[PDB]
Write an enzyme that holds these catalytic residues in place. Structure first.
Site, PDB file in Angstrom:
ATOM      1  N   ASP A  45     -23.397  10.025  -9.726  1.00  0.00           N
ATOM      2  CA  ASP A  45     -22.305   9.820  -9.903  1.00  0.00           C
ATOM      3  C   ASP A  45     -22.044   9.598 -11.694  1.00  0.00           C
ATOM      4  O   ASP A  45     -20.903   9.409 -11.994  1.00  0.00           O
ATOM      5  CB  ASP A  45     -21.754   8.381  -9.301  1.00  0.00           C
TER       6      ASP A  45
ATOM      7  N   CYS B  73     -22.630  12.647 -16.996  1.00  0.00           N
ATOM      8  CA  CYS B  73     -23.507  13.781 -17.363  1.00  0.00           C
ATOM      9  C   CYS B  73     -24.256  13.336 -18.701  1.00  0.00           C
ATOM     10  O   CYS B  73     -25.624  13.778 -18.802  1.00  0.00           O
ATOM     11  CB  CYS B  73     -22.834  14.966 -17.364  1.00  0.00           C
ATOM     12  SG  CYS B  73     -21.665  15.223 -18.847  1.00  0.00           S
TER      13      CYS B  73
ATOM     14  N   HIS C  39     -19.511  19.752 -20.047  1.00  0.00           N
ATOM     15  CA  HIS C  39     -20.897  19.098 -19.650  1.00  0.00           C
ATOM     16  C   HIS C  39     -21.903  19.136 -20.555  1.00  0.00           C
ATOM     17  O   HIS C  39     -22.067  19.793 -21.414  1.00  0.00           O
ATOM     18  CB  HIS C  39     -21.254  20.397 -18.334  1.00  0.00           C
ATOM     19  CG  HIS C  39     -22.334  19.729 -17.455  1.00  0.00           C
ATOM     20  ND1 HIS C  39     -22.048  18.605 -16.693  1.00  0.00           N
ATOM     21  CD2 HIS C  39     -23.708  20.065 -17.119  1.00  0.00           C
ATOM     22  CE1 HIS C  39     -23.133  18.401 -15.858  1.00  0.00           C
ATOM     23  NE2 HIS C  39     -24.139  19.113 -16.220  1.00  0.00           N
TER      24      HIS C  39
END
Lengths: 76, 278
Positions: free
Chosen positions: B64, B67, B209
């Site tokens: 969770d 990133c 990301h």
């Protein structure tokens, strides 16, 4: 009415808006076009960073007016 | 012609390192990031011009945690809340600690230069508000992070960070839309180099990301060290983020001075090696 949003690269986008529309609404419309979330957007007009709460009429934004868009990208 | 590179490696756990490396070995790769950055010519362009370099691949994020923090907290493998703990340290450093004023000046100075491109001029209240949002982002778990947060993270880790990334966001038409700010070198400039790790944390960024980069040799645990260039594909030295604290002074002469300073800063904080282009 229609207004234009311009990036630092010169990329230009047209948006259908009303003077009553908030800056948040405009950013949300930008996301519809480009997919960038509103909180990672900054809108600039007449040398001033527009606040999310105020409306376009509050900044004298009119038809064929050009807003400038800069990003605050985030990763995740 | 010459080009600068530096070695990097995965952390070595003092206990359960074998288990950790097994999870690395079974890790999936972030295919979309690999494909996008390789095609854009940002990732693994060096494989052809340097025969002894390795193809680098982005590890998929797990759990969770954010990133970026997950990629940066591999050294704390074995602790479930490692991402959360790293976030607290990043927040603590911005909110408290000795270097927070210098960090803030570096941010404001770079943002000020950026503002000039749009004829924008912040009031003091606007500066405070923009700073508050950066603090808020760091304080909230699960929230994504900005360029400056990566800079602060380098200080938390006391380690250089190298991010591989494209330079421009582009539209559906394929035309350039806006700049990507993440690519480049992040040094712990407010931390004395004597107290820093020299081997960099190497990351890649694509489509909101972050991923840790590894070679296949590292991923399979056959070799510890991999290499990463310190230039772009045009052999220009990568951008150095937030390199100027105006509290420490500031100024072709101007451009070349910025170039020599960059080289000296890299020398102070990194173990740069120079190899011929093949």
């Amino acid at each position: 009415m229609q207004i234009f949003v311009k990036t630092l690269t010169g990329k230009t986008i047209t948006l259908e808006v009303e003077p009553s529309d908030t800056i948040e609404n405009v950013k949300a419309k930008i996301q519809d076009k480009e997919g960038i979330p509103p909180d990672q957007q900054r809108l600039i007009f007449a040398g001033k960073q527009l606040e999310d709460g105020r409306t376009l009429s509050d900044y004298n934004i009119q038809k064929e007016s050009t807003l400038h868009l800069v990003l605050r990208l985030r990763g995740x | 012609m010459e080009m600068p590179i530096c070695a990097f490696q995965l952390p070595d756990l003092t206990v359960y390192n074998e288990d950790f490396r097994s999870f690395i070995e079974r890790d999936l790769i972030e295919q979309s990031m690999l494909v996008a950055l390789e095609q854009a010519g940002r990732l693994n362009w060096w494989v052809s011009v340097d025969p002894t370099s390795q193809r680098l691949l982005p590890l998929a994020t797990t759990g969770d945690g954010n990133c970026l923090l997950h990629a940066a907290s591999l050294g704390m493998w074995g602790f479930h809340d490692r991402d959360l703990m790293l976030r607290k340290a990043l927040y603590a450093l911005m909110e408290k600690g000795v270097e927070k004023e210098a960090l803030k000046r570096r941010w404001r100075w770079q943002q000020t230069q950026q503002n000039k491109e749009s004829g924008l001029v912040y009031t003091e209240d606007e500066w405070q508000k923009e700073w508050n949002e950066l603090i808020k982002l760091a304080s909230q778990p699960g929230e994504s992070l900005e360029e400056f947060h990566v800079f602060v993270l380098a200080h938390v880790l006391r380690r250089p960070i190298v991010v591989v990334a494209d330079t421009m966001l582009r539209d559906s038409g394929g035309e350039a839309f806006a700049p990507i700010p993440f690519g480049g070198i992040y040094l712990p400039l407010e931390v004395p180099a004597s107290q820093c790790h020299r081997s960099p944390l190497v990351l890649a960024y694509d489509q909101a990301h972050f991923s840790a980069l590894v070679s296949m040799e590292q991923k399979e645990n056959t070799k510890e060290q991999a290499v990463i260039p310190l230039t772009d594909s045009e052999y220009k030295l990568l951008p150095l983020h937030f390199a100027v604290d105006p509290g420490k002074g500031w100024e072709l002469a101007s451009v070349i001075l910025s170039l020599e300073v960059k080289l000296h800063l890299l020398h102070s904080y990194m173990n740069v090696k120079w190899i011929p282009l093949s």
